[PDB]
Amino acid sequence: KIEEGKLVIWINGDKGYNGLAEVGKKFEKDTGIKVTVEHPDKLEEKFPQVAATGDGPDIIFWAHDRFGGYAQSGLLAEITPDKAFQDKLYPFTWDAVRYNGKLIAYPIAVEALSLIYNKDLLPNPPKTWEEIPALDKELKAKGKSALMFNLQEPYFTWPLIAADGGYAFKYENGKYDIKDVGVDNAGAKAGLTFLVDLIKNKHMNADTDYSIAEAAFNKGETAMTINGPWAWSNIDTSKVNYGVTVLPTFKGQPSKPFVGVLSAGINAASPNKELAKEFLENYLLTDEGLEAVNKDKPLGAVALKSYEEELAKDPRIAATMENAQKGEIMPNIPQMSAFWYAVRTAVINAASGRQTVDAALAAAQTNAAALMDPHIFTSNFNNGIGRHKTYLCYEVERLDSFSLDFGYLRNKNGCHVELLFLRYISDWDLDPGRCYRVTWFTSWSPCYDCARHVADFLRGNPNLSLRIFTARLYFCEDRKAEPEGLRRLHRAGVQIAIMTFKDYFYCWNTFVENHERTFKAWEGLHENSVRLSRQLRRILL
Numbered sequence: 001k002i003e004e005g006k007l008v009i010w011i012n013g014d015k016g017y018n019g020l021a022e023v024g025k026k027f028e029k030d031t032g033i034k035v036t037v038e039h040p041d042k043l044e045e046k047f048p049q050v051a052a053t054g055d056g057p058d059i060i061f062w063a064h065d066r067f068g069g070y071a072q073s074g075l076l077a078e079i080t081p082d083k084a085f086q087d088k089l090y091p092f093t094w095d096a097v098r099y100n101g102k103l104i105a106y107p108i109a110v111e112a113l114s115l116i117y118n119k120d121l122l123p124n125p126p127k128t129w130e131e132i133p134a135l136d137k138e139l140k141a142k143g144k145s146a147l148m149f150n151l152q153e154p155y156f157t158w159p160l161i162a163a164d165g166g167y168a169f170k171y172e173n174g175k176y177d178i179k180d181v182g183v184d185n186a187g188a189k190a191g192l193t194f195l196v197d198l199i200k201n202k203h204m205n206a207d208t209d210y211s212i213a214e215a216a217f218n219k220g221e222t223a224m225t226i227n228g229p230w231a232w233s234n235i236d237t238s239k240v241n242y243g244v245t246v247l248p249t250f251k252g253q254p255s256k257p258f259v260g261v262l263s264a265g266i267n268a269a270s271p272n273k274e275l276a277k278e279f280l281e282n283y284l285l286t287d288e289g290l291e292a293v294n295k296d297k298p299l300g301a302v303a304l305k306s307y308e309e310e311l312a313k314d315p316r317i318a319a320t321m322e323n324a325q326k327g328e329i330m331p332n333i334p335q336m337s338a339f340w341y342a343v344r345t346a347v348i349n350a351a352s353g354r355q356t357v358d359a360a361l362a363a364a365q366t367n368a369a370a371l372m373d374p375h376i377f378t379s380n381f382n383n384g385i386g387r388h389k390t391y392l393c394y395e396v397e398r399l400d401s402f403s404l405d406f407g408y409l410r411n412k413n414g415c416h417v418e419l420l421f422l423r424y425i426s427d428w429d430l431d432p433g434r435c436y437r438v439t440w441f442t443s444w445s446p447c448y449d450c451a452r453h454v455a456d457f458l459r460g461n462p463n464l465s466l467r468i469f470t471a472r473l474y475f476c477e478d479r480k481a482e483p484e485g486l487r488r489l490h491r492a493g494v495q496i497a498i499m500t501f502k503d504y505f506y507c508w509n510t511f512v513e514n515h516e517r518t519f520k521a522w523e524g525l526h527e528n529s530v531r532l533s534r535q536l537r538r539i540l541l
């Protein structure tokens with residue numbers, strides 16, 4: 001449901017979407033092809049929903065942190081720029097859009113948050129966060145506040161949380177450990193506690209959003225703020241005398257903002273994949289293109305070497321790059337949106353008092369995971385009681401071993417969990433140059449049909465290993481076909497086993513929102529496990 005011979009673009013409203021629409025005009029004049037530029041709310045949320053059915057825009061613009069998700073779902077076309085073009089752009093920006101061995105998007109510009117001060121109210125901006133209270137007291141007397149920034153988005157408070165030692169996923173040896181999450185470590189709590197204490201002590205209000213803070217600073221009501229390049233335009237229009245310096249340090253260490261890389265990706269359902277490539281390579285990622293945009297609203301430090309050398313003379317851009325170096329670049333992995341949704345809830349609740357810092361950050365670590373209700377796990381994985389629904393917990397590892405994703409799903413819409421997993425892993429289109437191992441923890445054995453498709457799919461993909469651990473056996477009677485289906489899976493190389501306490505214990509700690517409560521085994525677990533183990537042993541002979 002996407003029009004051919006036309007380009008629709010989605011970009012966020014805080015970017016220079018008018019500047020971009022002009023590049024679409026130049027492009028239209030030189031080709032005849034119309035270029036619509038829309039900027040819907042929550043476009044980053046809307047895209048995956050529409051794109052999954054063959055609708056959506058041809059090009060989507062967002063920071064790169066959300067693209068691994070889009071790629072896993074099979075929503076992005078593979079971009080393929082020649083070696084000549086890849087030279088035009090800084091190497092490290094290409095690395096930000098590298099996922100699953102492919103390039104998934106075109107990098108446009110590097111964004112990072114900076115401290116923005118009013119020279120008239122504060123000629124010397126504070127070097128530490130700890131001054132801000134005394135600074136706010138000194139200023140409150142004159143009818144002004146010291147600092148105002150958006151507290152409704154974790155992006156803006158992340159620099160303070162990350163400073164003392166908070167982090168998203170541990171990065172070591174070039175890879176990300178998705179099981180080592182550092183949102184609740186000592187550092188995180190320290191930085192966030194400072195934030196809350198500012199709110200308790202009446203130096204910041206908890207309800208301050210983006211528009212409120214932007215209006216405060218642009219009317220000279222608050223001495224400082226914290227924002228990105230995109231904000232500079234309206235500060236100019238307001239004729240405030242502003243500087244753009246380094247984010248203050250916390251406990252001696254620098255604030256570590258998450259660095260975004262504005263990126264264009266192409267809808268895999270687009271018929272206009274060529275048009276999009278032509279537009280992005282030869283009209284936007286040029287000198288003329290980026291300027292048209294950067295004049296509407298600043299991009300930061302663009303990815304285009306030629307045009308960046310020119311922009312880097314700006315002292316504002318210098319500070320941006322200084323903060324970016326101090327900080328880290330955002331991971332692009334699918335876990336990132338979950339992480340962002342989680343951290344968001346923490347800062348809001350901790351800031352409003354609904355929770356304590358320690359409590360909020362605890363829940364964040366847990367929420368960022370795909371976790372089951374404990375009642376649902378016990379209700380369904382009991383090896384003695386047969387519910388009429390199937391649950392599947394899965395882990396997907398890479399044999400280099402190293403885990404890429406873990407989650408759970410249940411049968412839905414008359415669609416068995418086995419076929420649902422097949423779609424999820426097909427859509428992903430894993431790099432066939434490497435080897436992976438899929439592990440299922442399922443509550444029922446697979447029906448006969450699904451045993452075909454899983455066997456077919458596995459002979460279709462020699463580089464995948466499947467291990468199924470099951471709680472019960474479905475229709476393993478002699479007047480049923482299912483028992484052979486388990487042999488056919490076994491012959492396709494699949495390791496089938498019955499779950500045991502070790503397995504239930506692992507699942508309890510991995511796929512369940514257990515609240516630290518220890519796994520209590522049910523009466524008949526060890527007996528049922530033993531009985532079934534033999535019953536299976538009898539099937540695979």
Ligand SMILES: OC[C@H]1O[C@H](O[C@H]2[C@H](O)[C@@H](O)[C@@H](O[C@H]3[C@H](O)[C@@H](O)[C@@H](O[C@H]4[C@H](O)[C@@H](O)[C@@H](O)O[C@@H]4CO)O[C@@H]3CO)O[C@@H]2CO)[C@H](O)[C@@H](O)[C@@H]1O
Pocket residue numbers: 012014042044045063064065066111153154155156228260337340341344
């Ligand atoms: O929870 C309710 C909210 O849900 C939606 O917000 C989500 C996004 O969908 C997530 O992707 C994520 O947002 C990240 C964002 O992905 C990340 O790039 C960064 O965004 C910066 C961006 O780099 C910069 O260019 C500029 O646009 O500012 C952005 C920050 O505002 O950080 C984001 C998170 O702070 O998480 C959010 C929820 O936090 C939906 O959009 C919301 O309307 C909804 O309320």
Ligand SMILES: [Ca+2]
Pocket residue numbers: 324325326327328
């Ligand atoms: Ca760094």
Ligand SMILES: [Zn+2]
Pocket residue numbers: 416418446447448449450451
């Ligand atoms: Zn089935």
